[PDB]
Design a protein around this nucleic acid. Sequence first.
RNA 1: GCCUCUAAGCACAACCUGCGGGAACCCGUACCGCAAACCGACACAGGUGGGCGGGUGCAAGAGCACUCAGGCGCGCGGGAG
RNA 2: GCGAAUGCCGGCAUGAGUAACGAUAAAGAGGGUGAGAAUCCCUCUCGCCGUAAGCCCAAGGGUUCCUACGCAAUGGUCGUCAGCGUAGGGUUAGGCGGGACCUAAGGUGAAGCCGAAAGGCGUAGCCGAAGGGCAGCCGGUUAAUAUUCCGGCCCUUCCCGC
RNA 3: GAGCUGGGGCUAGGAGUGAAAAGCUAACCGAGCCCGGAGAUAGCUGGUUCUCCCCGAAAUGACUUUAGGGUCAGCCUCAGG
RNA 4: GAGCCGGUAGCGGGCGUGGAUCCCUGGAUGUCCGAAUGGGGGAACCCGGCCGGCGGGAACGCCGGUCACCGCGCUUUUGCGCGGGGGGAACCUGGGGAACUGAAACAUCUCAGUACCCAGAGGAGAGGAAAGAGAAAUCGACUCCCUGAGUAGCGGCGAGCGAAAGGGGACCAGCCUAAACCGUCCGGCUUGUCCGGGCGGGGUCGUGGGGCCCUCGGACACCGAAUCCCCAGCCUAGCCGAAGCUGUUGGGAAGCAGCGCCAGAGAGGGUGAAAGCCCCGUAGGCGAAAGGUGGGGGGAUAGGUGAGGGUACCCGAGUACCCCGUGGUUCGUGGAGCCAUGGGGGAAUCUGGGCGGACCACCGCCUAAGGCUAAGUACUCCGGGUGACCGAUAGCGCACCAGU
Lengths: 64, 73, 76, 110
Amino acid sequence: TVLHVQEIRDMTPAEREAELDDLKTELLNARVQAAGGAPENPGRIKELRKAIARIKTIQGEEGD
Amino acid sequence: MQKDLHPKAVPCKIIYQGQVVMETMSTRPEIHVDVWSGVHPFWTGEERFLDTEGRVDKFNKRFGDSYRRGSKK
Amino acid sequence: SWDVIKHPHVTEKAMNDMDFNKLQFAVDDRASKGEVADAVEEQYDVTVEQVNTQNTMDGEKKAVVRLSEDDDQEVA
Amino acid sequence: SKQPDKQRKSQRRAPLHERHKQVRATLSADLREEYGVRVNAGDTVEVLRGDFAGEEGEVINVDLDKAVIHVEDVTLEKTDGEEVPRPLDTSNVRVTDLDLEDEKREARLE
RNA sequence: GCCUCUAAGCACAACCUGCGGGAACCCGUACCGCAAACCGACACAGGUGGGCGGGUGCAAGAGCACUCAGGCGCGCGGGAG
RNA sequence: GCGAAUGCCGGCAUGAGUAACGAUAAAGAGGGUGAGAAUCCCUCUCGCCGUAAGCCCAAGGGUUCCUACGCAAUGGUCGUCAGCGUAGGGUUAGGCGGGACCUAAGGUGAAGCCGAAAGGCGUAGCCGAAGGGCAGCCGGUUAAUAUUCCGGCCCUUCCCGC
RNA sequence: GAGCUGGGGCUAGGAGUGAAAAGCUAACCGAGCCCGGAGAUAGCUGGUUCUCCCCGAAAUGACUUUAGGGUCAGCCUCAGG
RNA sequence: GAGCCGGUAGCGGGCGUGGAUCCCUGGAUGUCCGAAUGGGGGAACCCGGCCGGCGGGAACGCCGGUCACCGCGCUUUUGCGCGGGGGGAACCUGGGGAACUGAAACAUCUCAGUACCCAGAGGAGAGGAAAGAGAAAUCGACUCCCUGAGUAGCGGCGAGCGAAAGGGGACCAGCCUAAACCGUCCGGCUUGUCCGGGCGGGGUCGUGGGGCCCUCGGACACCGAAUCCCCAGCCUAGCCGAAGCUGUUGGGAAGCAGCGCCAGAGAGGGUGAAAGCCCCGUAGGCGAAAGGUGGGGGGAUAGGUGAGGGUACCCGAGUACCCCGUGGUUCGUGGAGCCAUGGGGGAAUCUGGGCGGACCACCGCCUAAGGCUAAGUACUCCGGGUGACCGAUAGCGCACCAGU
């Protein structure tokens, strides 16, 4: 639970974007991470991923 | 389908077979052959809806040709 | 379109590779010098140095970026 | 659900809660008699069969999963040593102290 | 590729050249490879295309006897005769 | 309802501890490791190649290649050895090869031509190769790669500017 | 040299190819191979099961593209008169 | 309704009754191949225009989005906007279509119009209001089940093949258009009165249609759809849901004993060894939704046809009919017809024109040479039910990292 449609939906396209960019970035960070062998289990990892997910979701629907 | 008439079909079938009669006019008949062949007409040049020429054969040909039921000359 | 590259291919060589120069990694495979390089470029400070490529039977796509004469961080 | 095998088909393949359907039962006098509608699950009770038969214990873990549960009391120790909670054969299961100190427990079963 | 030119646009901006900066991808590489890794169902004295094939001797020569570089002793060993 | 069909399927005995070790190009010795070594590692005699039992390019096969562990079965004996097991790692190119160029056979194939239907043919254009064409070479460098990685030397095509 | 050859392809299996014996056509083509007619027909060949009671056979005659089959008779068996 | 991150049980970490896992339905992503369709191609790969950010372009410029195959109509203009094709176990009709084997050979025949291949429709197609059947002046769509009937009958009259009307039953059900006659026009020739195509008339069910003159007459007649919610059935999970405990031989009891209850639900299955009452989300029995598909059924939509005589008359087809050569039919050349056609002649518009099995007279039937038509039968990939149906060499061959 968190963030959420509409709300985020008020996060105009421009943003919608930028917001994702980072989006990956972080995630991406997550990766290196793993391989690293340092950190542990990122429920986050997943999530994040998803969140982002939907993210687009809505967005698109929104009508791109 | 490129061996018919256009103005109707007439191709195909054909169960021929010869024998040696000699019946009603005395005694009875006999049998033999067991083949199958063709049987049709011929085609001429015409035209329709921007060139096309047509084809179909005699009969029919004598018709529509004279007239034209989907395209004249 | 979105993400970009992959992650930091890590190994005896590579380790020593990204070290001294260049930098070897897991490259989705898609993207090439072009589409490739970039990614690198945008992501990692230093610009479009150079590069070579490779894949294999495995899954991963091998890629390399010769150094910007600048940074890289031992452990990436 | 009109044949032998369509029981494994709408119980565990379907809603796992259908397996909740399994956690079904009753218990002591109070509560029970009182009715039997509105459960708790990880409540307490005291089996009624198997050597351990007629025993005292409590509801430790809603295992529906494995098809049964565990009862702190009811248990056993390995052979290396250490003790441990045994498997709880859904079957012989008793509950009287209807876990309900939690307002949400008393707002459903007792 | 080199020269001839229509369409056609350049014809102070079309092509040739000169210097200076800028760009250069997609997939293939290991090792086997007169072969136990290739076909013969097997580590089967069977076949499989191109490159000089090192020397000394023999009239010459990828034929021959010994050996250069490199390769190997055959993947079962003893013992009577 | 079964011996029983040179029956089908499965197991299990025969001959039998005899027949075979896949070329009569032979080995033997010292040390070393190991639970255990004719059969592994180092070393020293000795024998066989040598037009090969040479390195190389291909085609085919695709990790079989290296490195650290290990031998249950495959190795027609062993086996600490492996082209066997598990784990990790290895092969990078503006100029090498294939395409981003070209066509003959041939194959496709808008138009065109004929079949009962499926189909047949087939122009131009396209597919089609160690045939045509095209811009480099020598040394170094790891457990493996290399005309690609190092470096020294040699270039080509496109683009913008003048 | 109607020379040997790699690579690329064309023909095809009642039809191909064949300096031609019926050869070769994915290791036995006198007409390939797989699935389908289909479990083809098959006087020939085998094969043809638990006990027990009762009686007791022919290996001739007549006609057959019939003679090592089978029709009709003759010899068996059970039910009633 | 309170546990979970799938089969992985294991390490390391974590979401959750200010309704998690999962059951539903409708979604947004759906990388590359595959009818492939942008172009090429040894599938799953490699190539091109337009827009596109503008993007690292650290003091230097790219993927993403996209887009477009070809045969089909035709608002033709320069052609813009709709359909198709590929599947698919079995079943369907058409197109084409065979030997074995029987006949104790084999040429006729049979297996058969079967097996196969091809095309294509569907969820069902097939077919379908009659130039039908037959003869009691009798019957009426087509289809399918029983029956007719192994009959009438076909035939080296040998092996075999082997109809139909009529009666019983399931279902019902009817409609259109050229069909130049009328008028409307639009386009031609070239102005008249010609052909032409869109609008109505009519647009035939069982003989009518128009055109004329007088009687007309002045509201219940919905189909194959069209429509509205209706019970929309199902769509997976919907959920309650009668009633025993002690004692006991037991490693385990639900067994052996004692008392106790249920009850439209003693169907079975799970429960440590055989329970109606322990679990069962079962039969008892009632339950249940905002989205996906019906009949029933309610209504208007209702599309739509619906009466009288008369007149010289013009109006469902290009080939019926006839000769030869085949078909199907029970018909194998036959005394041999009907319907269907391969070639050649080539009629009629109601006293017309086929028909009732050579033909002919007379009687009796029917009205062709265009089209649509749900329901009654077939078939199981799918889901359920049930078994004098099987148990790991039986069953589908394959009970679970097998068409491998």
